[PDB]
Design a protein around this nucleic acid. Structure first.
Ligand SMILES: Nc1nc2c(ncn2[C@@H]2O[C@@H]3COP(=O)(O)O[C@H]4[C@@H](O)[C@H](n5cnc6c(N)ncnc65)O[C@@H]4COP(=O)(O)O[C@H]3[C@H]2O)c(=O)[nH]1
Ligand SMILES: [Mg+2]
Length: 92
RNA sequence: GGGCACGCACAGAGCAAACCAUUCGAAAGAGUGGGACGCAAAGCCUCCGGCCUAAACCAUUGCACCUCGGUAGGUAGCGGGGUUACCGAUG
Protein backbone atom coordinates (compact mmCIF):
# COMPACT_ATOMS: atom_id res chain seq x y z
CA UNK A 1 0.00 0.00 0.00
CA UNK A 2 1.53 3.31 -1.23
CA UNK A 3 2.54 6.01 1.20
CA UNK A 4 4.20 9.43 1.42
CA UNK A 5 7.08 7.70 3.17
CA UNK A 6 9.39 5.12 1.62
CA UNK A 7 11.08 2.66 4.01
CA UNK A 8 14.63 1.79 2.97
CA UNK A 9 16.86 -0.92 4.35
CA UNK A 10 19.83 -3.16 3.58
CA UNK A 11 21.78 0.06 3.99
CA UNK A 12 25.45 0.30 4.95
CA UNK A 13 25.68 0.65 8.72
CA UNK A 14 29.19 2.12 8.55
CA UNK A 15 28.08 5.46 7.07
CA UNK A 16 27.73 8.29 9.57
CA UNK A 17 24.21 9.63 10.17
CA UNK A 18 24.57 13.03 8.49
CA UNK A 19 26.45 11.76 5.44
CA UNK A 20 23.86 9.05 4.88
CA UNK A 21 21.03 11.63 5.23
CA UNK A 22 22.75 13.88 2.71
CA UNK A 23 23.36 11.30 0.01
CA UNK A 24 19.94 9.72 0.47
CA UNK A 25 18.51 13.19 -0.16
CA UNK A 26 20.86 14.00 -3.03
CA UNK A 27 19.62 11.14 -5.15
CA UNK A 28 16.03 10.88 -3.89
CA UNK A 29 15.40 14.57 -4.68
CA UNK A 30 15.08 14.03 -8.42
CA UNK A 31 11.71 12.33 -7.86
CA UNK A 32 10.09 15.30 -6.14
CA UNK A 33 10.13 17.41 -3.01
CA UNK A 34 11.34 15.70 0.14
CA UNK A 35 9.58 16.54 3.39
CA UNK A 36 12.14 14.79 5.59
CA UNK A 37 14.79 12.09 5.83
CA UNK A 38 14.84 10.18 9.08
CA UNK A 39 18.00 8.12 9.40
CA UNK A 40 19.74 6.04 11.89
CA UNK A 41 22.09 4.02 13.68
CA UNK A 42 20.73 2.73 17.01
CA UNK A 43 20.37 -1.03 17.40
CA UNK A 44 16.96 -1.75 15.85
CA UNK A 45 16.93 1.32 13.59
CA UNK A 46 20.45 0.64 12.43
CA UNK A 47 21.07 0.53 8.73
CA UNK A 48 17.80 2.05 7.79
CA UNK A 49 15.93 5.14 6.71
CA UNK A 50 12.61 6.86 6.00
CA UNK A 51 12.32 9.33 3.16
CA UNK A 52 9.18 11.38 3.58
CA UNK A 53 7.88 12.72 0.28
CA UNK A 54 5.36 15.61 0.05
CA UNK A 55 3.05 13.71 -2.25
CA UNK A 56 2.68 9.96 -2.79
CA UNK A 57 3.23 9.92 -6.58
CA UNK A 58 6.80 10.96 -5.84
CA UNK A 59 7.32 8.04 -3.40
CA UNK A 60 6.00 5.54 -5.95
CA UNK A 61 8.24 6.79 -8.74
CA UNK A 62 11.17 6.71 -6.28
CA UNK A 63 10.54 3.13 -5.16
CA UNK A 64 9.96 2.03 -8.76
CA UNK A 65 13.17 3.51 -10.16
CA UNK A 66 15.72 2.90 -7.44
CA UNK A 67 14.62 -0.45 -6.13
CA UNK A 68 17.67 -2.69 -5.93
CA UNK A 69 19.89 0.32 -6.62
CA UNK A 70 23.33 -0.35 -5.07
CA UNK A 71 24.20 2.46 -2.66
CA UNK A 72 27.42 2.75 -0.66
CA UNK A 73 28.26 -0.75 -1.99
CA UNK A 74 24.89 -2.19 -0.91
CA UNK A 75 21.67 -2.73 -2.96
CA UNK A 76 18.90 -0.60 -1.40
CA UNK A 77 15.74 -2.47 -0.49
CA UNK A 78 12.71 -0.22 -0.82
CA UNK A 79 9.17 -0.66 0.43
CA UNK A 80 6.46 1.79 1.50
CA UNK A 81 6.26 2.66 5.20
CA UNK A 82 3.39 0.80 6.89
CA UNK A 83 2.37 3.89 8.80
CA UNK A 84 2.20 7.60 8.04
CA UNK A 85 5.11 9.60 9.42
CA UNK A 86 4.31 12.00 12.26
CA UNK A 87 4.94 14.90 9.86
CA UNK A 88 2.23 13.76 7.47
CA UNK A 89 -0.28 12.87 10.15
CA UNK A 90 0.33 16.22 11.76
CA UNK A 91 -0.51 18.14 8.61
CA UNK A 92 -4.01 16.66 8.41
C1' G B 1 29.57 -26.46 5.78
C1' G B 2 26.56 -29.65 2.85
C1' G B 3 22.21 -31.05 0.19
C1' C B 4 16.35 -29.08 -1.14
C1' A B 5 13.71 -25.46 -3.26
C1' C B 6 13.19 -20.05 -4.95
C1' G B 7 14.42 -15.51 -9.09
C1' C B 8 12.66 -8.70 -6.98
C1' A B 9 18.40 -8.48 -6.93
C1' C B 10 23.29 -7.98 -5.65
C1' A B 11 28.59 -9.87 -7.09
C1' G B 12 31.66 -12.96 -11.02
C1' A B 13 30.90 -15.83 -15.53
C1' G B 14 28.30 -18.42 -19.78
C1' C B 15 25.07 -19.29 -24.09
C1' A B 16 23.41 -17.22 -28.97
C1' A B 17 17.67 -15.48 -32.46
C1' A B 18 17.52 -13.21 -37.23
C1' C B 19 21.05 -12.44 -41.23
C1' C B 20 25.45 -13.78 -43.99
C1' A B 21 29.65 -17.53 -45.31
C1' U B 22 30.50 -22.54 -45.37
C1' U B 23 29.92 -27.99 -44.52
C1' C B 24 26.64 -32.34 -43.63
C1' G B 25 21.62 -33.77 -45.02
C1' A B 26 16.30 -36.32 -49.59
C1' A B 27 14.18 -32.99 -46.37
C1' A B 28 12.90 -30.73 -41.79
C1' G B 29 17.04 -29.57 -39.78
C1' A B 30 22.44 -29.83 -37.76
C1' G B 31 27.84 -28.62 -37.50
C1' U B 32 31.65 -24.66 -37.92
C1' G B 33 32.79 -19.45 -38.37
C1' G B 34 31.08 -14.30 -38.12
C1' G B 35 26.98 -12.02 -35.52
C1' A B 36 23.08 -10.82 -30.91
C1' C B 37 16.77 -11.60 -30.40
C1' G B 38 16.55 -13.02 -26.20
C1' C B 39 17.76 -17.01 -22.03
C1' A B 40 18.19 -18.53 -14.49
C1' A B 41 19.98 -23.74 -16.85
C1' A B 42 18.70 -21.04 -24.10
C1' G B 43 24.16 -26.83 -20.06
C1' C B 44 23.10 -32.39 -21.29
C1' C B 45 19.48 -36.32 -22.44
C1' U B 46 13.60 -38.07 -27.09
C1' C B 47 11.28 -41.20 -21.96
C1' C B 48 5.92 -38.73 -22.59
C1' G B 49 2.79 -34.99 -25.13
C1' G B 50 2.97 -31.38 -29.25
C1' C B 51 4.82 -29.50 -33.63
C1' C B 52 8.14 -30.12 -38.36
C1' U B 53 10.13 -33.47 -42.41
C1' A B 54 8.64 -37.76 -45.24
C1' A B 55 12.90 -38.84 -49.91
C1' A B 56 14.35 -44.08 -50.16
C1' C B 57 12.24 -48.95 -47.90
C1' C B 58 7.80 -52.04 -46.64
C1' A B 59 2.28 -52.28 -46.65
C1' U B 60 -1.68 -50.30 -49.79
C1' U B 61 -5.62 -50.39 -56.47
C1' G B 62 -7.94 -47.50 -52.08
C1' C B 63 -14.90 -43.36 -53.41
C1' A B 64 -12.62 -38.52 -50.58
C1' C B 65 -14.31 -34.00 -49.30
C1' C B 66 -12.48 -32.47 -40.28
C1' U B 67 -7.96 -35.16 -40.38
C1' C B 68 -5.93 -40.36 -40.09
C1' G B 69 -0.34 -46.63 -42.59
C1' G B 70 4.25 -48.42 -40.98
C1' U B 71 9.11 -47.00 -40.85
C1' A B 72 12.65 -43.09 -40.25
C1' G B 73 14.76 -38.29 -38.95
C1' G B 74 14.11 -33.69 -36.48
C1' U B 75 12.95 -29.56 -32.66
C1' A B 76 15.90 -29.86 -25.72
C1' G B 77 15.66 -22.05 -28.26
C1' C B 78 7.74 -25.90 -27.84
C1' G B 79 6.40 -28.13 -23.49
C1' G B 80 6.54 -32.29 -19.30
C1' G B 81 10.12 -35.35 -17.18
C1' G B 82 15.24 -36.86 -16.13
C1' U B 83 20.21 -35.29 -15.01
C1' U B 84 24.69 -31.72 -13.88
C1' A B 85 25.87 -26.40 -11.99
C1' C B 86 27.02 -20.20 -10.10
C1' C B 87 25.02 -16.23 -6.84
C1' G B 88 21.94 -15.29 -1.94
C1' A B 89 17.72 -10.29 -0.76
C1' U B 90 14.21 -16.47 0.85
C1' G B 91 10.37 -20.63 2.45
N1 LIG C 1 23.60 -16.20 -10.28
C1 LIG C 1 22.15 -16.26 -10.43
N2 LIG C 1 21.49 -15.13 -10.46
C2 LIG C 1 20.13 -15.19 -10.60
C3 LIG C 1 19.52 -16.42 -10.71
N3 LIG C 1 18.20 -16.20 -10.85
C4 LIG C 1 17.99 -14.90 -10.81
N4 LIG C 1 19.13 -14.26 -10.68
C5 LIG C 1 19.27 -12.87 -10.60
O1 LIG C 1 18.00 -12.22 -11.12
C6 LIG C 1 18.40 -11.58 -12.49
C7 LIG C 1 17.37 -11.80 -13.56
O2 LIG C 1 17.01 -13.16 -13.59
P1 LIG C 1 16.13 -13.59 -14.80
O3 LIG C 1 15.80 -15.02 -14.76
O4 LIG C 1 14.87 -12.91 -14.95
O5 LIG C 1 16.70 -12.90 -16.02
C8 LIG C 1 17.99 -13.40 -16.42
C9 LIG C 1 17.80 -14.39 -17.56
O6 LIG C 1 16.80 -14.03 -18.30
C10 LIG C 1 19.01 -14.10 -18.44
N5 LIG C 1 20.18 -14.82 -18.06
C11 LIG C 1 21.31 -14.28 -17.73
N6 LIG C 1 22.21 -15.23 -17.46
C12 LIG C 1 21.66 -16.42 -17.65
C13 LIG C 1 22.01 -17.80 -17.57
N7 LIG C 1 23.32 -18.21 -17.19
N8 LIG C 1 21.12 -18.76 -17.87
C14 LIG C 1 19.85 -18.49 -18.25
N9 LIG C 1 19.49 -17.22 -18.33
C15 LIG C 1 20.32 -16.17 -18.06
O7 LIG C 1 19.11 -12.84 -18.38
C16 LIG C 1 18.67 -12.43 -16.88
C17 LIG C 1 19.86 -12.47 -16.06
O8 LIG C 1 20.44 -11.17 -15.91
P2 LIG C 1 21.17 -11.06 -14.55
O9 LIG C 1 22.37 -11.85 -14.33
O10 LIG C 1 21.66 -9.72 -14.64
O11 LIG C 1 20.19 -10.95 -13.36
C18 LIG C 1 19.53 -12.09 -12.83
C19 LIG C 1 20.23 -12.45 -11.41
O12 LIG C 1 20.80 -11.31 -10.87
C20 LIG C 1 20.30 -17.57 -10.68
O13 LIG C 1 19.66 -18.81 -10.79
N10 LIG C 1 21.62 -17.46 -10.54
MG1 LIG D 1 29.20 -18.32 -32.52
Amino acid sequence: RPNHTIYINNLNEKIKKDELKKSLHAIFSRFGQILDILVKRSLKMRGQAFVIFKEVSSATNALRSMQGFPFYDKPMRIQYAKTDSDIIAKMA
